[PDB]
């Protein structure tokens, strides 16, 4: 029920082909989608499942000026950006104008650390997948194919959490003051009969 001018979709625990279809419609709907922690997306099937499904895609290049062949991008962000590129009519004028509304990045840059991060309840792994199934993590997968920036982001994201954790306790200590002040306002308890 959201028509935000910009939405931020934290992607840990989602599926790739189901989030890329939810997002692909909201791009054509006119929104402005940012997908952070794209590195911690999931794919049904075990670790080698998409691994040969993408090592096969590396064997596919043009046979004329092989610097003009397919550009097999290795970043976890562009893995999913590829997924939202065939879902859109990217050969029209409405496709290539929709794609510039999507900003798919890994980790969380500070311009989106301090904002709300909604999730999609129709693409999540703990819902859509049977318990005890085989699943592979994209950012853990694409590192084994060439994305050489794994040890930095896992270090960087660890620093952001403890800083955000420090942000949370100050926020948690904030409403504990208003928890007292909410019932301390006596009007709440005798005029809760309007449902509130």
């Amino acid at each position: 029920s959201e028509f935000q001018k910009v939405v931020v979709i934290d992607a840990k625990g989602h599926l790739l082909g189901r989030l890329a279809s939810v997002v692909a419609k909201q791009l054509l709907g006119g929104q402005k989608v940012v997908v952070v922690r794209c590195e911690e997306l999931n794919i049904s099937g075990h670790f080698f499942r998409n691994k040969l499904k993408y090592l096969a895609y590396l064997r596919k290049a043009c046979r004329y000026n092989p610097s003009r062949g397919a550009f097999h991008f290795r970043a976890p962000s562009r893995i999913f950006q590829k997924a939202v590129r065939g879902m859109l009519p990217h050969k029209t004028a409405r496709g290539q104008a929709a794609l510039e509304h999507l900003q798919a990045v890994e980790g969380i840059p500070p311009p989106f650390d301090k904002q709300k991060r909604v999730v999609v309840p129709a693409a999540l792994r703990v819902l859509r997948l049977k318990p005890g199934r085989k699943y592979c993590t994209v950012g853990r997968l694409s590192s084994e194919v060439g994305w050489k920036y794994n040890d930095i982001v896992a270090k960087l994201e660890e620093r952001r959490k403890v800083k955000s954790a420090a942000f949370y306790q100050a926020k948690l200590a904030k409403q504990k003051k208003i928890a007292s002040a909410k019932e301390a306002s006596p009007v709440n308890q005798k005029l809760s009969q309007f449902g509130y």
Binding site: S1, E2, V7, I9, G13, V22, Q26, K116, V118, V119, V120, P121, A122, L124, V126, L127
Partner: protein
């Protein structure tokens, strides 16, 4: 849905045969126009009274007398295979004979991919004793100390604010 129909019938009486015999069937049919079509199917293969000879006398529904009581049904099936040879005995645990044969069809549609006309049900008896139930899993939903957590949980409106509890 399904609705079990009591069907009886005979042939046209002649001077040679003043009183034809009456034949009762308890079969299952989503409506009544397929009951009185399946009825002439079974009776043609067994009693050899063709559709150009016989007539239909009475169709009635059999509502289950105790739909609120749990039961177990042993199900005798003659299945017409691609070699056309299968007698089958299968047990289902539910409340209504209408509801069992729907589940009977569904399972039979999965493991053995049976169609409508590929199945001729033979006999349906409400099996009652606990020592005659010959299935392991049906037996285990019948011990007094049964228990399980909920399976297949999932508790529009896309873009949920927080994580689902899923507990």
């Amino acid at each position: 849905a399904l609705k079990e129909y009591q069907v009886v019938g005979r042939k046209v009486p002649t001077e040679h045969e003043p009183v034809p015999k009456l034949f009762r069937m308890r079969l299952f049919a989503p409506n009544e126009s397929v009951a009185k079509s399946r009825y002439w199917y079974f009776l043609k293969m067994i009693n050899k009274v063709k559709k150009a000879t016989g007539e239909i006398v009475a169709i009635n529904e059999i509502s289950e007398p105790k739909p609120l009581k749990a039961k177990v049904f042993g199900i005798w099936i003659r299945y017409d295979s691609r070699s056309g040879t299968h007698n089958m005995y299968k047990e289902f645990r539910d409340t209504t004979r209408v509801g069992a044969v729907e589940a009977m069809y569904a399972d039979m549609a999965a493991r053995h991919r049976a169609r409508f006309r590929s199945i001729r049900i033979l006999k349906v008896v409400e099996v009652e004793k606990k020592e005659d139930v010959r299935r392991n899993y049906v037996k285990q939903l019948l011990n007094p100390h049964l228990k399980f957590p909920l399976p297949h949980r999932r508790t529009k409106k896309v873009f949920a604010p927080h994580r689902p509890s899923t507990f």
